[PDB]
Design a protein around this ligand. Structure first.
Ligand SMILES: CN(CCc1cnn(-c2nccc3c(=O)[nH]cnc23)c1)Cc1ccc(F)cc1
Ligand SMILES: [Zn+2]
Ligand SMILES: [Zn+2]
Length: 343
């Protein structure tokens, strides 16, 4: 009810301040769903045209091999040789790989879950780069300027997969497995162009139920690594989630829209056809407790030292936290302290 995905329509004035807007959507309860859609003002555009990127190199395209049955699957990401956007699009749009005919989303979603183990598609995933023009100042994924910037501030080391933008060139049936962000951070995803991207979300207050369910389904993966979901290989159909009483919601992201994922917000999804999305991680003051308590991959990976954040934002707790006495319990319903001005 209050864990349902929400869509926001900021005005141009409201859009200019990223962090303030994030605070605003949390004061509205957006974080409870674990995922929110943000439709930018009509006048806003991050790039004049996308007709000048055909020679853009996808260095490590991945063939997505999926094995499984009865709504439970494991995705094996097979590296293919480098290719350009032009070559990628030719494959995406060919008879062999293009989107099937469909009337309603529910029909396309059925095709996805029935055919994800067949005819493995190629995902032009994790390409370092941005499609934003240099002068765009609003919601610029390249430079959000959140408190996540503090790691680079004190050491200069940029952790690969954190605080840098990534591009994802999708084709029909390419997917992202169930996961939460690295260090349980926030994430932003903008669909630059093409066919939609469909998303599934589990509210952070029900995240441990999803983990317990995936542990029961893959006991071998769980014994090897407690945090095996962080490998981003596990696919679980909505039918299985429904059967085992895991609450979830679904949303389709169209070209020109943003998706925000919240700390400990489990999400998965798939691309409807040839498209391109830009993404990065970011943080608010609320994330600090999430980063301290993040259950990380012990086999295996992205790790951020919390010491800098605790020392700056929670110095009274520093000694208690460094001694293993920080017994703090996270309340997933509470908005970020920055949202106080809206409540
Ligand atoms: C380090 N790599 C990013 C990790 C990462 C974190 N969030 N996230 C995603 N989150 C949301 C949406 C998407 C999406 O549409 N498409 C791809 N990845 C998405 C992907 C690993 C990796 C990327 C893609 C993939 F398939 C499998 C592994
Ligand atoms: Zn993600
Ligand atoms: Zn692991």
């Amino acid at each position: 009810p209050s864990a349902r995905i929400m869509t926001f329509y900021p005005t141009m004035e409201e859009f200019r301040n990223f962090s303030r807007y994030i605070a605003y959507i949390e004061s509205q309860g957006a974080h409870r769903a674990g995922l929110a859609k943000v439709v930018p003002p009509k006048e806003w555009k991050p790039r004049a045209s996308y007709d000048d990127i055909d020679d853009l190199v996808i260095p490590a395209p991945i063939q997505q091999l999926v094995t499984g049955q009865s709504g439970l699957f494991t995705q094996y990401n097979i590296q293919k040789k480098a290719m350009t956007v032009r070559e990628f699009r030719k494959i995406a749009n060919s008879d062999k790989y293009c989107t099937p005919r469909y009337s309603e989303f529910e029909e396309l979603e059925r095709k996805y879950w029935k055919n994800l183990t067949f005819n493995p598609p190629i995902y032009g995933a994790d390409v370092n780069g941005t499609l934003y023009e240099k002068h765009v100042d609003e919601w610029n994924i390249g430079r959000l300027r959140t408190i996540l910037d503090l790691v680079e501030k004190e050491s200069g080391i940029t952790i690969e997969g954190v605080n840098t933008p990534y591009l994802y060139f999708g084709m029909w049936k390419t997917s992202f497995a169930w996961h939460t962000e690295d260090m349980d951070l926030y994430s932003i995803n903008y669909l630059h162009f093409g066919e939609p991207k469909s998303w599934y979300s589990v509210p952070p207050e029900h995240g441990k139920r999803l983990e317990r369910l995936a542990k029961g389904f893959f006991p071998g993966s769980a014994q090897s690594c407690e945090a095996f979901l962080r490998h981003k290989m596990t696919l679980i159909s909505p039918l299985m989630l429904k059967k085992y009483g895991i609450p979830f919601d679904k949303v389709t992201q169209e070209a020109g829209e943003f998706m925000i994922t919240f700390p400990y917000g489990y999400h998965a999804g798939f691309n409807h056809g040839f498209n391109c999305a830009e993404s990065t991680n970011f943080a608010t003051r609320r994330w600090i407790e999430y980063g301290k308590q993040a259950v990380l991959c012990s086999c295996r990976m992205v790790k951020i030292s919390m010491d800098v954040f605790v020392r700056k934002f929670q110095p009274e707790r520093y000694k208690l936290w460094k001694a293993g006495k920080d017994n703090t319990v996270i309340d997933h319903t509470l908005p970020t302290p920055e949202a106080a001005e809206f409540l």
